[PDB]
């Protein structure tokens, strides 16, 4: 029931996005104090899927983000009994990811429960086409408000013709005990796909996340 300097964890996600119902179950890894983490992704059910991974890559882990020394690390202080999170992504084109999720620590593992909606994706738009080339680095805001933690960031995912294709996301992290909440500080976030199958569904990514000071 501790967080030890190397850590697993599983994860499995429902998700439902413009209508087409699929699961994902994965298995990732990690060195929470380093900021360092990697998943496995499977699809296991209503694969392959007919959009990009990328708005399903940022879903699968902030327990992973290396803190200064000095800054309450809220994920972590939050464990055993873990933290909730609930997340909406508002694409420019309209369509709209909204996503909440539930960390515990059972048996020394993590395990991470998703469930994802999203809706109103264009037809012919970069995330039902497969236009996208995953996420720029990013920097999420985090800062505390009515006794959670809130980020926000507008962050880009790369376009296969040269573009960007934009969002805007805003998550509000709650410990499921009350734990001490940081004052407003900065998450420094890359996170990238680094294999997939032909066909994604089995994909594995890496996140390096730092916090620092504002």
Do not use: C
């Amino acid at each position: 029931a501790i967080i030890k300097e190397f850590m697993r964890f599983k994860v499995h996600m429902e998700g439902s996005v413009n209508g087409h119902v699929f699961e994902i179950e994965g298995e990732g890894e990690g060195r929470p104090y380093e900021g360092t983490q990697t998943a496995k992704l499977k699809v296991t059910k209503g694969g392959p899927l007919p959009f990009t991974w990328d708005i399903l890559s940022p879903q699968f882990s902030n327990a992973y983000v290396k803190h200064p020394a000095d800054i309450p690390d809220y994920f972590k202080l939050s464990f055993p009994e873990g933290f909730k999170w609930e997340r909406v992504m508002k694409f420019e084109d309209g369509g709209v990811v909204t996503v909440t999720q539930d960390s515990s620590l059972q048996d020394g593992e993590f395990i991470y429960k998703v469930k994802l909606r999203g809706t109103n994706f264009p037809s012919d738009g970069p995330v039902m086409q497969k236009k996208t080339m995953g996420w720029e680095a990013l920097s999420e805001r985090m800062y505390p408000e009515d006794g959670a933690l809130k980020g926000e960031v507008k962050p880009r995912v790369k376009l296969k013709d040269g573009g960007h294709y934009d969002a805007e996301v805003k998550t509000t992290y709650k410990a499921k005990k009350p734990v001490q909440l940081p004052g407003a500080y900065n998450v420094n976030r890359k996170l990238d796909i680094t294999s997939h199958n032909e066909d994604y569904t089995i994909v594995e990514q890496y996140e390096r996340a730092e916090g620092r000071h504002s």
